[model samples]
Target: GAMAPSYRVKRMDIAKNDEECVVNAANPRGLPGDGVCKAVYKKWPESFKNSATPVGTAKTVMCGTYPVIHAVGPNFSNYTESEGDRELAAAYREVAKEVTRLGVNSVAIPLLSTGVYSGGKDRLTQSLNHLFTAMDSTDADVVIYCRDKEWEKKISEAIQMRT
Candidate 1:
């Protein structure tokens, strides 16, 4: 049986997650850094006990009714014109597939690779395009969580321009 297409896109501050699932960028080794990973680990240390994996792998942890997806993604300790474009696309795809299988109705995803990873805005744009294209018309409601109001507006505009 096919589920109805009830998916829609929205933008919100990454800190506020009223969805069933939230995406977090994690190192393949499950090492915590200066972002969502750190906070998540601090709040829920058990989440990473078995989440450690190779880059591009995704792990999910359940906190009450909310599930947080920790995807081991690229780490940009240096600069690059474009990096981790297709990499995070695949990682995020895995997250989407897993979330779908888990029956998560709504999800909140940050702009992966755009942070300390330095995936570059151009590359991030490409990644977002690929992700949204794959997620188009799905039954999940994808809420893009941005860093702040500035990023929220910019990301929302970018999404609008793409769709």
Candidate 2:
């Protein structure tokens, strides 16, 4: 199904223009159907992760012309924690607060601390849950985009607890 591609994760790749690579044409920084993120980083050896767009993986980005929260503080490139869990919570919460301040109605966020920071799945979920719950109570629509069903399921399950 288009909704559920698979349970297993694969590195995400979006097609790009012949001249430049990008994640989506909806992006003004990109162009008319210019493309999505490249299958691999044309500049570096890195890939944007399975099925993620450049903007999607970006730590910080704009919502339309407005700034949204940076999606990352630590990296999960190695699929390990890049920082301590305590630091992760504080750092990401600050970013989330910034997003709210910037006047963005809704935003897309990924599993930030869980992927590349000291936070484990539970900790990561809790940290993000705290932030998102605040956003929700503050009247922000939370959209959590992910690479596969496992994470979606995980996040969904977590949300239920808070609800």
Candidate 3:
């Protein structure tokens, strides 16, 4: 049987989330650059220094308050559309797997690959699909944290269309 994880779209900073674990949309090198990754880095820079999470994979590290799962999503600029789609889905699956492994009750994640990685509106919709599908395999509740109101609305609308 399959599990159905609860999902919520919140307009807030992911670093301030109280979930047991948070997912960072990281680069392949797991380097902190912008968006959610920058926020996570601001709090704990050292933890990511040696990380090298490949695309479609995730690496877990303790960040004092909660465990941060650095999930490396595909860079659309380098990948063909189909390749990016596959990798993004794989990335979410990796995050779900990590959450199950950590036994976390809840987690906050951003729209992976949507920032500097260049995922547009279509990709945003695809990301939500991938996220919802992959997370269904986990017991942990999922929160899709958005930094802007526009994205909050977009994600909400996308989710509504799904249900």
Candidate 4:
């Protein structure tokens, strides 16, 4: 049986990716603060207004050519190690659930919470692991997009290091 879905890690701007859906690493309040969220926000400001996505969950909004899934990933700096791990996994799960609900064949997603939220290598590894596991049941072709070259390299390494 196929376990993991077809997926790849790419260095590109996810906000402009041509996939049917894109997942943003968003804050709990769903406000577009910075990073990928800001870029996506610029495209459709009205979609994100007054939105509140709790941590470990996701909210979807229809934007131009595709829909956006705002996944509220855990802020590691504020969470205990175990708490962060659980919430991070939950966030990825919520993303996959949303993708399934939308019935989209392709999706572009970023590594949640690794940026200004301050999650480091450990969180990076965890994010990838949880993402792969959560995405296994979905049939979508997934692209894990990273804007930073160094983060792209790191994600490549992390993917290779997994069993």
Q: How high is the CA lDDT of each candidate model?
A: 0.66, 0.37, 0.82, 0.82
Against the true structure, candidate 2 reaches a TM-score of 0.48
lDDT of 3 by residue, 6-92 (tens): 778999888888677889888777667888888988876766856677899989888665688899999888889899889999999
Off by over 4 Å in 3: 1-5, 119-122, 160-163
Query: RMSD (Cα, Å) of candidate 1?
Result: 3.4
| True lDDT of residue 117, candidate 1 | 74
List the candidate 1 regions with Cα displacement exceeding 4 Å: 1-15, 77-83, 119-123
Top lDDT prediction, candidate number: 3
- Comparing 2 with 3 on TM-score, the higher-scoring candidate is 3
lDDT of 2 by residue, 13-98 (tens): 32211211121212212212211212223322232223222322233343334332333333233234433444445444554465
RMSD (CA, Å), each prediction: 3.4, 10.9, 2.7, 2.9
lDDT value, candidate 3, whole model: 0.82
Q: Which runs in model 4 stand beyond 4 Å of their true positions?
A: 1-5, 119-122, 157-163
Model 3's TM-score against the true structure: 0.88
Q: Which RMSD does model 3 reach against the true structure?
A: 2.7
Please provide, for model 1 over 1-163, each residue's C-alpha lDDT reduced to its tens digit, 9 standing for 90 to 100. Answer: 1254333345444446777777777777777776767766776666766777666667887766567788766665542334455566677777767777778777777666777676334345655676676567457777776556666666677766755
lDDT of candidate 4 over 37-119, digit per residue (tens): 89878876766855578999989887655688889988888988789889989999999899999988889999887787754
lDDT of 3 at 61: 81
- Candidate 4, position 123, lDDT: 58
